[PDB]
Amino acid sequence: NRHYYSITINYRKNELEQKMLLNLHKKSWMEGLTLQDYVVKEMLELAK
Amino acid sequence: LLKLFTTMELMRWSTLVEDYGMELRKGSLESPATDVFGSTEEGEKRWKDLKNRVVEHNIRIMAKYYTRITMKRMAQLLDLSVDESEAFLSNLVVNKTIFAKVDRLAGIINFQRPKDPNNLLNDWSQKLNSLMSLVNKTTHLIAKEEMIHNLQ
C-alpha cells in the first residue's frame, strides 16, 4: 500500500453481445439442438 | 468349394454328390480325390466328415437365422428327415456352443432363443437412433431446402 491501490473493475453489459452469449450458452447446453434426450436403466441399481 | 462357404444359403447333399462324385472319376489329379473321397478306410471317414460339413453347413446358417419356423418344414429344409434331424442335430448339439429351440407338443417348434431379456436396447436403438436422426433431419433437410432455395 506504499503508493498503490486497486481500482474498480466492473464487468459491464454488451447489449450487442450479452443476450446472444446467453443464447449460445443456454440454447447450446439445453440438449444442444433442444431435441436430443427428450444411463436410464443401470442408474436404477446405482441409485438404489 | 468356395461357393459352399460364402454366405452358404442352403445346400443340397445330392448336388454335392454330383459335383464331387464326378470328380472321383474325372481325372486331372486323381490322387487327392482318391485320398479324401476315393479311399474307403479313411476316405469314407472323410465322407463322414463331408456329412459333418453338409450338416454344419445347415446348422451354422440356421443358427444365424430361422426365428419362428416349424419342424417338419425344418427337416425338409435341412434336406434330411426328422429322425435324421435328431441324429444329425444331436451330434452337433454335442458341439454345445449353439443355442437353438425346439418343442414337440404335437410336432411343432418355436424360436427367439434368449427369451428376450430386453426393454433396454429397444429404448437404445429405437429412441437414440430415431431422435438423433431427427436432430439430423433439421441440420441437413433444412440445409438441402436452403440449397434448393439458393438455386431458386
Curated annotation (Swiss-Prot), chain A:
Modified residues (Phosphoserine): S28
Tissue expression from the record: Widely expressed. Highest levels in heart and skeletal muscle.
Subunit and interaction comment: Component of the 19S proteasome regulatory particle complex. The 26S proteasome consists of a 20S core particle (CP) and two 19S regulatory subunits (RP). The regulatory particle is made of a lid composed of 9 subunits including PSMD4, a base containing 6 ATPases and few additional components. Within the complex, PSMD4 interacts with subunit PSMD7 through their respective MPN domain. Interacts with TXNL1.
Function: Component of the 26S proteasome, a multiprotein complex involved in the ATP-dependent degradation of ubiquitinated proteins. This complex plays a key role in the maintenance of protein homeostasis by removing misfolded or damaged proteins, which could impair cellular functions, and by removing proteins whose functions are no longer required. Therefore, the proteasome participates in numerous cellular processes, including cell cycle progression, apoptosis, or DNA damage repair.
Family per record: Belongs to the peptidase M67A family. PSMD14 subfamily.
Protein name, as recorded: 26S proteasome non-ATPase regulatory subunit 14
Organism: Homo sapiens
Name of the gene this protein is made from: PSMD14
Interval of the full protein contained in this chain: 197 to 253 of 310
Curated annotation (Swiss-Prot), chain B:
Family stated for the protein in its record: Belongs to the proteasome subunit p55 family.
Domain PCI: 1-116
Listed name of the protein: 26S proteasome non-ATPase regulatory subunit 12
GO BP of this protein: proteasome-mediated ubiquitin-dependent protein catabolic process
Organism of this sequence: Homo sapiens
Assigned keywords, A-Z: Acetylation, Intellectual disability, Isopeptide bond, Proteasome, Ubl conjugation
KW Acetylation (keyword) present: yes
Parent-record interval covered: 305 to 456 of 456
Quaternary structure note: Component of the 19S proteasome regulatory particle complex. The 26S proteasome consists of a 20S core particle (CP) and two 19S regulatory subunits (RP). The regulatory particle is made of a lid composed of 9 subunits including PSMD12, a base containing 6 ATPases and few additional components. Interacts with ERCC6.
Implicated disorder: Stankiewicz-Isidor syndrome: A neurodevelopmental disorder characterized by delayed psychomotor development, intellectual disability, behavioral disorders, mild dysmorphism, ophthalmologic anomalies, feeding difficulties, deafness, and variable congenital malformations of the cardiac and/or urogenital systems.
N6-acetyllysine modifications at: K64
Role description: Component of the 26S proteasome, a multiprotein complex involved in the ATP-dependent degradation of ubiquitinated proteins. This complex plays a key role in the maintenance of protein homeostasis by removing misfolded or damaged proteins, which could impair cellular functions, and by removing proteins whose functions are no longer required. Therefore, the proteasome participates in numerous cellular processes, including cell cycle progression, apoptosis, or DNA damage repair.
One Gene Ontology CC term in the entry: membrane
